[PDB]
Scaffold this active site. Sequence first.
Site, PDB file in Angstrom:
ATOM      1  N   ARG A 141       4.889  -2.850 -13.338  1.00  0.00           N
ATOM      2  CA  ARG A 141       4.139  -3.421 -12.313  1.00  0.00           C
ATOM      3  C   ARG A 141       2.553  -3.556 -12.256  1.00  0.00           C
ATOM      4  O   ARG A 141       2.084  -4.355 -11.647  1.00  0.00           O
ATOM      5  CB  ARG A 141       4.713  -2.982 -10.992  1.00  0.00           C
ATOM      6  N   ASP A 155      -4.856  -0.772 -11.383  1.00  0.00           N
ATOM      7  CA  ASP A 155      -4.482   0.149 -10.512  1.00  0.00           C
ATOM      8  C   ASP A 155      -4.843   1.596 -10.843  1.00  0.00           C
ATOM      9  O   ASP A 155      -4.207   2.497 -10.273  1.00  0.00           O
ATOM     10  CB  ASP A 155      -3.038   0.035  -9.938  1.00  0.00           C
TER      11      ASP A 155
END
Lengths: 314, 303
Positions: A141, A155
């Site tokens: 993800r 991230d």
Amino acid sequence: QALLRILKETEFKKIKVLGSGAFGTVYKGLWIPEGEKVKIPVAIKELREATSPKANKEILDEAYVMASVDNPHVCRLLGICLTSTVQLIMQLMPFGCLLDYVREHKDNIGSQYLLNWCVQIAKGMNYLEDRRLVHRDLAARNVLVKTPQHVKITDFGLAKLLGAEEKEYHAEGGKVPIKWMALESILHRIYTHQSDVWSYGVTVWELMTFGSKPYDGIPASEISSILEKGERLPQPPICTIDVYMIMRKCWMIDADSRPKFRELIIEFSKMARDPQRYLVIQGDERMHLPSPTDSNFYRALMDEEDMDDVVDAD
Amino acid sequence: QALLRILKETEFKKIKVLGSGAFGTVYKGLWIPEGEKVKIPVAIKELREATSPKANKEILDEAYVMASVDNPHVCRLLGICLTSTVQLIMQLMPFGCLLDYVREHKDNIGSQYLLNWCVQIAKGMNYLEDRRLVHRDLAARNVLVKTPQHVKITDFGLAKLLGKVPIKWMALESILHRIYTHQSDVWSYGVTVWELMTFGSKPYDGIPASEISSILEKGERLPQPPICTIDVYMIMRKCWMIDADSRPKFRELIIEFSKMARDPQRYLVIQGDERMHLPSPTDSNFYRALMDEEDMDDVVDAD
Ligand SMILES: *CCC(=O)Nc1ccc(OC)c(Nc2cc(-c3[nH]c(CCCO)nc3-c3ccc(F)cc3)ccn2)c1
Ligand SMILES: *CCC(=O)Nc1ccc(OC)c(Nc2cc(-c3[nH]c(CCCO)nc3-c3ccc(F)cc3)ccn2)c1
Ligand SMILES: [Cl-]
Ligand SMILES: [Cl-]
């Protein structure tokens, strides 16, 4: 430090919501340069509040590190807005994240794409290790698709920035990616480049299963127990034993026995030169990498940054 | 060769009209790659129906040449769709063309932007000259703004491809004898610079195009722009000399405008210039990472 733009609320606006994760909500946004008449698409993540009352100066210091990454396979933080909420701004990736891409394109992804994605993720993680940066939440993800031929890690560092309350490491489907974490991270909050290597193994497993959920149906509270008992993720149907052994080596209890990202680059690059020997996919012959014509068009239209050439079959 | 993609009608869609010129209508379009779920903005120019149509082999040959240009200040043709109509596809420039940009920004453009635009246009034209390519229709409308710091020349070679005539930008020998050279491009460069320095004024306003060759032969030229010192105006006048070989070279124009860009307020006198500088390194880094990742020479900054 000119690498991080401090944005005011007045010069950007959130439009469509694109998704949500452990770290915040992602929006498609428009940046309006002051004095101009254009609206530039951007990606905006409005962060959840950190589990500590840290100064905006510390938030900015960690954001400056996120803005300092310079590698073709790591997304650079471009801007930040510090008002009531912390909002992060970067370039919009119109193809989405790799997890959703492989789920949506299951029956049309060939071995050459899969192995090159593993190479590029390993290259990006190797850069982060070189920068003495631990990601802590590597997963499919958190790999973004700039083009189907070019993926980039996002991230990194957000986990350490925002933290997580201790109850979430014992909850179900919580904010803590237990099923991606090395055993030492579950038991003792130890996060290293070698625990990143463990999560890399799970990420590769996600890709090779076209987006299956790891340990689906097993409660997160029992993951540490089954790992201690020697249980691991199963061999994906398309993976030869060579590919499956690399994943299993990433999940060894001894962190120093796991492969290094520099070693993973070399091994997956070797397999990418003979992709059909290491992954068994039916109809693989018509799932080649793009022609030079389509690659030139792809690059000039939406991906003008420098990048290593994809590894093609011999 | 592999630099020009031949597109199917089904893989792109025109959504918005952006403008029109002598050669056709410009659309904002969306490219839809087969098998994918994304819509990628593009610019599409549908050429108008010529009265003396060209053979399809001839059209494709010139499209390959237009697709072969590799320079930070020349727009590369990326794709073409050859059906009943000719459609050209390239990267979308969201800031528009430089002519409309300077008009809309008539009251906030500083000297450093104006002089760098002249540098970048000269760099792009010098590259075209290096490739033995004559533009034939250089004008502020054919300079596109990728970022306010980065402009690129478009529409080179369209004039020959489609056989409406920009008399007020043309060298005298082009008006009289339809002679087009790199030195006649230099004349059009001079008019283009005049457009920028006047913030998009119309050249020879009130003079019909039918009279332009007459007034040029009488020695009349475009006037000195209010903001230009004589240093800048003398360059423009040299671009409009009757003897084409006495006009400056694009390589020389790069150096002179780069020299002036290092002391911009000495060479352009603009009201309120003490506010409108070039972007900080912070703002430039943000601009490039977001929408301008291609290799480019850095802007010429005042020292
Ligand atoms: C699967 C997760 C995902 O991001 N899907 C997705 C669907 C549609 C999109 O555009 C049409 C994009 N583009 C995009 C996403 C991100 C991003 N993704 C995440 C993970 C969310 C759940 O895992 N986080 C971000 C992000 C956004 C802004 C920042 F400043 C930092 C990180 C970034 C850029 N483009 C994705
Ligand atoms: C000054 C005329 C103009 O083009 N204005 C303009 C307004 C809005 C825009 O996007 C929001 C753009 N972007 C753009 C334009 C072009 C382009 N412009 C011309 C000339 C018009 C009058 O001379 N021709 C083109 C073009 C388009 C596609 C091709 F294959 C070749 C040439 C290109 C890219 N982006 C402009
Ligand atoms: Cl998230
Ligand atoms: Cl046109």
